[PDB]
Amino acid sequence: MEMEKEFEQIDKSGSWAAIYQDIRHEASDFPSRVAKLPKNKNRNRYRDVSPFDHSRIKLHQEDNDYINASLIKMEEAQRSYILTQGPLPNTVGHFWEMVWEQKSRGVVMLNRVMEKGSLKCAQYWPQKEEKEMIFEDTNLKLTLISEDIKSYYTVRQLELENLTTQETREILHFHYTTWPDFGVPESPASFLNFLFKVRESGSLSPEHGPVVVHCSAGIGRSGTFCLADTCLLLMDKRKDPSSVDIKKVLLEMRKFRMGLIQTADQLRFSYLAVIEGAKFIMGD
Numbered sequence: 515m516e517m518e519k520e521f522e523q524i525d526k527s528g529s530w531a532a533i534y535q536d537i538r539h540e541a542s543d544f545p546s547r548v549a550k551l552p553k554n555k556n557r558n559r560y561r562d563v564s565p566f567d568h569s570r571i572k573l574h575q576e577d578n579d580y581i582n583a584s585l586i587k588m589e590e591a592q593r594s595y596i597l598t599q600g601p602l603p604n605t606v607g608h609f610w611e612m613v614w615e616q617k618s619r620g621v622v623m624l625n626r627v628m629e630k631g632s633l634k635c636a637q638y639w640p641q642k643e644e645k646e647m648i649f650e651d652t653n654l655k656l657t658l659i660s661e662d663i664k665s666y667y668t669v670r671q672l673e674l675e676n677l678t679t680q681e682t683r684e685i686l687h688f689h690y691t692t693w694p695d696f697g698v699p700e701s702p703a704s705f706l707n708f709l710f711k712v713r714e715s716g717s718l719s720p721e722h723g724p725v726v727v728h729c730s731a732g733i734g735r736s737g738t739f740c741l742a743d744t745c746l747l748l749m750d751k752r753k754d755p756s757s758v759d760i761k762k763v764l765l766e767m768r769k770f771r772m773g774l775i776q777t778a779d780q781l782r783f784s785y786l787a788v789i790e791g792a793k794f795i796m797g798d
């Protein structure tokens with residue numbers, strides 16, 4: 515059955531809130547003891563969003579190895595993602611330390627720095643070529659190389675330098691700039707165009723470390739991005755694309771980070787994105 519037929523019954527039955535609540539009830543509960551240590555209170559944006567101990571990313575330092583970030587490892591799809599919060603004023607140096615240590619090629623940003631009149635994450639990359647950023651706590655330098663501004667997203671070329679070894683790497687910044695301040699996009703067309711641009715860059719490919727993906731909390735929009743990507747990859751691999759169960763993929767991803775998909779509207783949008791994206795994957 516085309517995932518869309520099923521989509522239609524849930525709309526007519528008006529059962530989005532119902533299914534969403536079922537996911538919330540069946541989701542994994544694992545300890546997050548490191549996130550809750552008193553020394554880490556200013557490293558968390560939200561008191562109720564923490565990485566599990568078993569899947570957290572560790573910083574390579576003896577002082578304090580903690581960052582609010584999780585490794586999502588999808589065994590059948592052969593994809594890995596790091597999902598993290600938007601960086602705070604005192605964790606911008608930790609953020610770039612993680613990108614360096616994990617060998618990531620790409621950063622995917624799904625929020626604006628200001629939304630709803632409030633700050634949703636630090637200004638953590640340079641806005642002008644000639645004004646580079648230095649992170650003294652982690653010994654990194656970050657330079658803006660080029661910027662390509664389009665109607666629905668911006669792509670930036672960044673140079674990250676490990677000041678300790680003088681090694682450099684090219685990082686690509688994929689910034690989706692048009693998610694609305696309230697609700698979800700009316701059409702998934704621009705979100706799917708954006709996902710295909712990240713894939714075309716090589717950022718999601720096994721020759722690199724995992725992509726780093728964030729929004730403000732790193733669970734809602736960030737969850738929608740990895741759920742859509744993995745479901746479309748599984749539809750490309752399986753003899754029967756109709757066997758891909760989006761609810762079962764989401765519960766597998768929730769073994770690695772709590773709270774992925776924050777609302778019934780984000781769940782419906784994820785279904786729409788996968789249904790509309792499949793009309794490319796299956797030969798069009």
Ligand SMILES: O=C1NCN(c2ccccc2)C12CCNCC2
Pocket residue numbers: 520523524527529533759760761762
């Ligand atoms: O009864 C249900 N429980 C959940 N869900 C569902 C979700 C993902 C894959 C298959 C089925 C439905 C059945 C179809 N429409 C109503 C809600």
